[PDB]
Amino acid sequence: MQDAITSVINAADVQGKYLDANSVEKLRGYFQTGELRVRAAATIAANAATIIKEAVAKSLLYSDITRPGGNMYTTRRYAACIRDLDYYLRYATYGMLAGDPSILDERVLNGLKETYNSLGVPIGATIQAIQAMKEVTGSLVGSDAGKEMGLYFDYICSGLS
Amino acid sequence: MQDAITSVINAADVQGKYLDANSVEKLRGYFQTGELRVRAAATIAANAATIIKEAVAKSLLYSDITRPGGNMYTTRRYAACIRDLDYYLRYATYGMLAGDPSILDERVLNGLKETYNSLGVPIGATIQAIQAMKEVTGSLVGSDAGKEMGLYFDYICSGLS
Amino acid sequence: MQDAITSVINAADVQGKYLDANSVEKLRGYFQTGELRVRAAATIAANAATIIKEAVAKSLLYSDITRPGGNMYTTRRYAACIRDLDYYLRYATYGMLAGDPSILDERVLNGLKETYNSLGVPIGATIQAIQAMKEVTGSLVGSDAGKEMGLYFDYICSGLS
Amino acid sequence: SIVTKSIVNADAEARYLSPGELDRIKSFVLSGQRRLRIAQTLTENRERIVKQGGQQLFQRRPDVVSPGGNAYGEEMTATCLRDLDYYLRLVTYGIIAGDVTPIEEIGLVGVKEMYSALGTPISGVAEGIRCMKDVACSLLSGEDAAEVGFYFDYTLAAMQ
Amino acid sequence: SIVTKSIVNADAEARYLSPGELDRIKSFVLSGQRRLRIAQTLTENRERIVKQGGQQLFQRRPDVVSPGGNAYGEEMTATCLRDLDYYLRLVTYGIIAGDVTPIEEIGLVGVKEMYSALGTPISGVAEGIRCMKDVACSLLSGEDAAEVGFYFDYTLAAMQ
Amino acid sequence: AYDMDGTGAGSLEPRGIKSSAVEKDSRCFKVTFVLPSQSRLYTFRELQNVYTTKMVPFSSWYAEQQRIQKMGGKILKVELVAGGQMRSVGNQ
Amino acid sequence: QIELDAAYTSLASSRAFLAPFAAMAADMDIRPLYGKNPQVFAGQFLGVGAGQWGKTGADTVRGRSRRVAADIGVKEFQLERVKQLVVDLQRALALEDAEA
Amino acid sequence: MLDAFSRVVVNSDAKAAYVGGSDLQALKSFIADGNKRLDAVNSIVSNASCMVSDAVSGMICENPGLISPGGNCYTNRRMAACLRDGEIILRYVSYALLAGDASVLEDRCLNGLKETYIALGVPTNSSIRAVSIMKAQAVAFITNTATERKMSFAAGDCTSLASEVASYFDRVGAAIS
Amino acid sequence: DVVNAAYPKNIKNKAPVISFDGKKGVKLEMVTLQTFAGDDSEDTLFDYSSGKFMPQKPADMGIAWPSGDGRQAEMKGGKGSFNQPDLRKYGPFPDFLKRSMDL
Amino acid sequence: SLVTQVILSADDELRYPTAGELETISSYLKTGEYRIRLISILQGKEQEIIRLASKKIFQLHPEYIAPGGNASGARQRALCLRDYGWYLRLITYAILAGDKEPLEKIGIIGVREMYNSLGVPIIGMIDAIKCLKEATVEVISQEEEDFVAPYYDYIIQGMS
Amino acid sequence: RTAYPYTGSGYGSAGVPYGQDTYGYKATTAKSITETAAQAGVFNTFVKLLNESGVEKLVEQAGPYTVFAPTDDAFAALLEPHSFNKLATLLRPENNDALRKVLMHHVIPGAFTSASLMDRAVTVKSLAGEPISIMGLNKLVTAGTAKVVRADVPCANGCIIHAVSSVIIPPNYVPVPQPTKPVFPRSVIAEIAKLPTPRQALGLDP
């Protein structure tokens, strides 16, 4: 659980040296985007339910995982999805603010693909839901902010694959 | 954890059909006797301690897993057996009522043979005990009821093997 | 978790025979060294912090695991060492009293080398520390008592290797 | 034994052994010469301690050997004395271990489940061990009879 | 009864009673006329059901009444039949309650602690209830004997 | 003390999990399992990882293994990491 | 047999396990409470009561030596089934012979 | 080459240690039965001319194709070499029983014996039986249970030297397998 | 096929085996001379099993349990009356992960 | 089903089913085919009933049908009858296994969050099921519709 | 930047997750003894002899064992003229008795990896009951007459599997004799004449 400042301090500390010009050079780069990330995390908090409603209706709403036999049939199973998609849109918001994807594999990625295989959850439909959820997130926060929030979505999709 | 009615429904709507007339013959077998299974589960509840006392005396208690060095020597280890044999005679009673062995592997079979290998419990003497316990159970409940209760004993013996 | 008396009773019991002359012959050999082990465990309890302070300063105090980047750099990581070395000097004291190294692999050795590889703890420097800790322990308790306490140190070093 | 559970006591408490624990491991090993003599007396007296043990057991509990009793006939009576040979053996272990830890995990843990599941009256086997105790303490002096009898009555306590 | 534990079941689950629970409270109260007739048969047959109950109990377990048995003499044998009158009474409660809930918290919960603490062979009192069961089911038709006997064997199961 | 005092059916403490563990047992397993909660959709509590691998003692593995299947869990692997086998004395 | 012979070595090992106590209880005074003289109430014990004698009588009388010993009906039954099938299946090949 | 004293030196050089009080109880017990070890080497070298003919001729009555023509004990020069390496191996095992460590066994006897016996075409499985009869004889002489010659001894346990000389022949029989 | 009515019960008699025993007569013999046979067929005429028999386990259903999440194993009846089609289809799915329809 | 509730509910107490529970299985299995005969009546009237359900759910709620509502459009209304088909199919399961779990493990548990993420007003779906129960009374006689009545209003109680 | 980095998170971390993969306590992936060998495809006679002989239950157990399972070329190498004398008699179907000890000599209590045998000679007895000397010198680890081929195979319960080149026979193992004829003395007068009388033992007669 490290942000961009924590990761910069760790690498500069792990060699026992002070924060030289290169370490502060990245820190200044993070502070420049500090204004963009909060507004990105602002609108995502507002439209959390709307984004997840848009992703599932655009990716896996009418596919036969939704129909009987599909992996999302029963109401408990459907309700687990939007609960499950809420974490991906939420933890990706944390990575967008912290500027470092360490929180994702610390709290989301580890034991995740090994868990879906246990339950039999289709990893293929899961990533496309996150990809569609990444597509709507670029709608709200804009282009570059969508590039930032989108940079952690595919990090989840990559490791979850 | 499905009974015969749950499996009929449950397969039934995993594709989502309604129950057609072909598959009410499971139901119509099962709901005929339904009368046979309760009386079978009735007497087994009454003679639970007597059945287990008959199986071990007919079975491994003459062996020598009973003597020193054998797998059943100490009183804690002997007492674990009749505790252990009680589950096989009990869960088999549940399968006999539910008409479906799903409860056995759900709650008995999984991690069972992998557990006895850890403790070093002899699977060979275990199955013999259940086979002898199956033999006395056919004494009480009769022939066809013994065929029903016996049908889940060897299911335990098969998977435990 | 067996001492010398527990191991002697187990082997004599596992064949179902009484304690013959050979079983009591080793038991008499253990009771003869009973006076030596307590005084050995006496002084080790007194100089627990002094022994660990002597071992780390003699083996791995100034090596570059101590410097930045080395495996022992941060104060949390340094403090984990003397916490970690305390168990080796403590559990070795238990083996010296019980006269049987069963407690070590029961409570120390199992999952130990598999744990240090996870954390990335250098097994090479660890054994050297225990070897140096074994060297100072022979200083306090004497020669033969050091031979006894030393006999369980390398047991840890062997299995931890 | 006293050595193994004085360790696992101080093991759980994250500490070493106190003087109270190490002056008794010390006191126990100097006691070890006298313990082997006591166990040596019961070792080759099992012929009398068991056979006279089942002597008073049947005179005090004729039901268990009468027709209908659990130990009826030539067969069960032999096993009727076999268990007494077991429990007499475990007392020799407890005397040398200086504790009922050998008797605890052998013949005591879950003993009521076994004898209830065998149809044996657990109170009857408790009467058998008491009859062995009077024979055992009659074979030793007063200083020893406070020990050899001391382990029997613990077995009597846990067996009811 | 079936009414009180079908409630406390649905009580714990934060819900009302399903059709599966309310079509059985319904099915039980229409069964109530037939239950009182069955309990009415055992009510004024306790003279024969108990006295013939202890009939076969002593013929099958003469140890308990022989000198040394727990129920020895004029005194204990009267109390020897008193307990059978108790358990025969609780079966009349279970038949009217439609469940062994009355028999559960009376005469079954912790019964082994009482009889072990009284010196009574708990297996012996189990033999007594089985002897009462054959007398009870001999007093009723086949449709009823599947019930009145049905509550005895539950008491047999919990009493060992 | 231990869980086999004489308790069985019809006894004062309620009929429950009875383990064959000795006095102060020192055997422990290394188990692995998933255990979906099956109760979050009417409680709406926060979510926790259900795939765990941990060392359970021998004194309470049976209760835990009996309970992991109670709530539909599946046990992927268990081992006896610490302790002996067929050991009369020494499990303490 | 060569698993029936392993059953006979387990019967010989089960008797040597109990022979220090089988002969040690052979000179004890084991007096019952009922069952022998008819002046004492024994109830159904008088003989045995109501179906409890068994199909054989030895299934019927416990002992370690008997109970692994009536085991022999089950391993010797499977050997005699596959042998004595060797009698008369050495007949169709025996007497098929003179014929061709 | 090493001995039982200098095996724990080069083990104590591996941990940059002094040979302190922990390791000297391993060596003072080694000289405690130092009279027992010399009573065990003396049972080997007193029958060593007879054990080598006992063991090579036991190999011949098991595998008689060696003395068959084209074999490996057929030529009489080729027989006299097989009596020689029965006792050179017994010379180096008796040094290993004397020194208490199998370094001189694993640096002089077995140092290239495997590619020797391939390149001479010697059957290796019969070289196991030439070695292992000397294992079953030396554990009979050291325990003094040889069935036709008993030697005089002060009585006591000797079974550690029996398994020590059985460990040195298995070091030979695995290195030439 | 049993087409050998050309070959009776007198097939393998092997009439010309001839043993001279010196310069006298040829001593003709009809010894049958069986092969190094073994007659490789399974499930012969009897059972040859006396006890020791609980070998039967069900087949592996994948990740799920055994005795399957039902739906991937045979229905037949009514589909229903309205039933909108899938139009995504996302692969057919396997052993359904543990929780049946009736979870 | 109902037997599954008894096996489960008896399994968490580590006991066999009691006297009352075995009634609950025995009475349920004796009413077996009548559920089987009833579901075939309803399966032949699924195209019967859902056509009548779309009668009154939309004359009551033209908000959903109108342009702007969720059910506006052909393909939105197309699955609209499909949700009735799955619900009616679920009730045939519930009528057979004589309890609420097939209506609860499917359909009820988490239904609001399903609809709320879909835009379907959850109050409207309650009237849809109430509309569906209103439609089932016409194609069903008075004998058997109160058998199926408690299975409908459980769904309404589940949805609030 | 140091090469041996480490695990953990937060400050004082090297950019590598805990346990190198975010798992502190990793679930194992090995199988047990007999089907780690079944997958290897080389221990075929070994796993089959275990299953027939009943020894396979013993090495099912969770105790830390060090199996020295010989590859079937070792079993195929049992056609020594020498070793066939002492081992061919086990091929008879009644001699399962010695087959268990001879197989039980290959199980060693403890987890002795080859790295743990750095120029060390330690003995131990098997689960058969007789001592065996494991000798690791010059990277040539020996177990009696083993000459180990493959170094180690990690197994389920912390057990190790080494592939050996031959079959270790126990030290005090005598081969079972072949089945023979119970012979009886002809006559009885050829045996009274075979016993020396008391008058012979004192030299009173020839």
Ligand SMILES: C=CC1=C(C)[C@@H](Cc2[nH]c(/C=C3N=C(/C=C4\NC(=O)[C@H](C)[C@H]4CC)C(C)=C\3CCC(=O)O)c(CCC(=O)O)c2C)NC1=O
């Ligand atoms: C210092 C280490 C050392 C040894 C271990 C021995 C062993 C040894 N033997 C021979 C040489 C030989 N060794 C054998 C031996 C045997 N063939 C068999 O079938 C038997 C199994 C076995 C006897 C037991 C034979 C038959 C030859 C003769 C080869 C020849 O003369 O061409 C040679 C080659 C020498 C030469 O011929 O020039 C060596 C090195 N000698 C040593 O110097």
Ligand SMILES: C=CC1=C(C)[C@@H](Cc2[nH]c(/C=C3N=C(/C=C4\NC(=O)[C@H](C)[C@H]4CC)C(C)=C\3CCC(=O)O)c(CCC(=O)O)c2C)NC1=O
């Ligand atoms: C076909 C040929 C053939 C032989 C010649 C013998 C050879 C022989 N002897 C022994 C076994 C032995 N061999 C000897 C050797 C000797 N005894 C002495 O006292 C002398 C020192 C030396 C003869 C000069 C000894 C001491 C033993 C151990 C047991 C004993 O004899 O006391 C063994 C090993 C055990 C065994 O495999 O049986 C063999 C193969 N056996 C055979 O099968």
Ligand SMILES: C=CC1=C(C)[C@@H](Cc2[nH]c(/C=C3N=C(/C=C4\NC(=O)[C@H](C)[C@H]4CC)C(C)=C\3CCC(=O)O)c(CCC(=O)O)c2C)NC1=O
């Ligand atoms: C009792 C059984 C019986 C037999 C097995 C034969 C064996 C046989 N053949 C010949 C005798 C002969 N046998 C052969 C045959 C041959 N010579 C050759 O060089 C050819 C390779 C081979 C032909 C296949 C010939 C050519 C003669 C000599 C001419 C003759 O006597 O016919 C003789 C007489 C030899 C003599 O005069 O001492 C005998 C006994 N005859 C018998 O009565």
Ligand SMILES: C=CC1=C(C)[C@@H](Cc2[nH]c(/C=C3N=C(/C=C4\NC(=O)[C@H](C)[C@H]4CC)C(C)=C\3CCC(=O)O)c(CCC(=O)O)c2C)NC1=O
């Ligand atoms: C321990 C390892 C082991 C063996 C090496 C064999 C050895 C062996 N073979 C036979 C017994 C036999 N052996 C042979 C074999 C032969 N006779 C011939 O004339 C041929 C030249 C040769 C075959 C190539 C025959 C023909 C029998 C008679 C029994 C039979 O045919 O089944 C017997 C029984 C002895 C008897 O009853 O007489 C034994 C022990 N069996 C074993 O258990």
Ligand SMILES: CCC1=C(C)/C(=C/C2=NC(=C\c3[nH]c(/C=C4\NC(=O)[C@H](C)[C@H]4CC)c(C)c3CCC(=O)O)/C(CCC(=O)O)=C2C)NC1=O
């Ligand atoms: C914070 C990091 C994190 C994640 C991501 C997580 C996931 C997780 N998802 C689960 C289930 C589930 N997840 C789904 C999801 C889906 N079905 C589909 O078809 C889609 C592809 C997908 C939605 C995108 C379903 C249906 C279940 C229920 C499975 C069942 O009942 O068997 C469960 C089981 C327990 C429960 O839901 O209460 C866990 C623990 N846990 C975590 O700690």
Ligand SMILES: CCC1=C(C)/C(=C/C2=NC(=C\c3[nH]c(/C=C4\NC(=O)[C@H](C)[C@H]4CC)c(C)c3CCC(=O)O)/C(CCC(=O)O)=C2C)NC1=O
């Ligand atoms: C070391 C601790 C320990 C004990 C105590 C023990 C007991 C034990 N007692 C047994 C039988 C028995 N035990 C008895 C005992 C008695 N009958 C009486 O009347 C008396 C009251 C009482 C003896 C004093 C009888 C009659 C049997 C045979 C029961 C039967 O055949 O059904 C058996 C089954 C046969 C056997 O394997 O021996 C065991 C295992 N095992 C142990 O490991």
Ligand SMILES: CCC1=C(C)/C(=C/C2=NC(=C\c3[nH]c(/C=C4\NC(=O)[C@H](C)[C@H]4CC)c(C)c3CCC(=O)O)/C(CCC(=O)O)=C2C)NC1=O
């Ligand atoms: C409603 C549930 C219930 C039960 C069952 C019950 C039992 C009970 N049984 C008792 C005594 C007794 N019970 C017996 C019983 C027997 N002797 C035998 O041989 C037979 C095996 C057995 C009867 C079939 C004897 C002999 C006593 C007197 C014991 C004594 O005086 O020490 C006593 C003490 C005296 C008394 O207050 O009556 C109680 C309380 N109380 C209850 O509330």
Ligand SMILES: CCC1=C(C)/C(=C/C2=NC(=C\c3[nH]c(/C=C4\NC(=O)[C@H](C)[C@H]4CC)c(C)c3CCC(=O)O)/C(CCC(=O)O)=C2C)NC1=O
């Ligand atoms: C409900 C499904 C289920 C089963 C079956 C189960 C078994 C199970 N059996 C156990 C032990 C045991 N099981 C036995 C059994 C036997 N010894 C023999 O010789 C016989 C072959 C056999 C009796 C048939 C023994 C002796 C132990 C004690 C082992 C020990 O103390 O090391 C243990 C260890 C903990 C404990 O008993 O408290 C578990 C968890 N757990 C479950 O959840």
Ligand SMILES: CCC1=C(C)/C(=C/C2=NC(=C\c3[nH]c(/C=C4\NC(=O)[C@H](C)[C@H]4CC)c(C)c3CCC(=O)O)/C(CCC(=O)O)=C2C)NC1=O
């Ligand atoms: C077995 C239990 C179960 C149900 C019920 C279920 C419902 C369900 N209803 C849906 C949509 C929908 N459902 C409606 C429904 C309605 N409009 C109205 O006016 C009505 C009151 C109501 C129908 C009777 C509409 C309008 C949509 C489309 C919303 C959209 O995507 O824009 C969707 C998205 C995909 C699809 O249509 O298949 C699901 C999964 N899934 C299940 O597993």
